[PDB]
Amino acid sequence: LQEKLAEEERRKSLPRRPPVVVIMGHVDHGKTTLLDYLRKS
Structure with a gap:
């Protein structure tokens, strides 16, 4: 349960x-x- 919140933290901070x-x-x-x-822009 502590590994699902650490996973959503490093992946949202790409x-x-x-x-x-x-x-x-x-x-x-x-x-x-x-x-x-x-293209010119």
């Missing part, structure tokens, strides 16, 4: 996070254009 983001939908939202813009 050193780095890189949160992955996907962009998708309809073509000519300037959609590829949007991607390009993002």
Whole structure:
């Protein structure tokens, strides 16, 4: 019971996070254009 609370403590305190983001939908939202813009940014 003391090993379930120590486990939830070191795992919630992960050193780095890189949160992955996907962009998708309809073509000519300037959609590829949007991607390009993002890249440029």
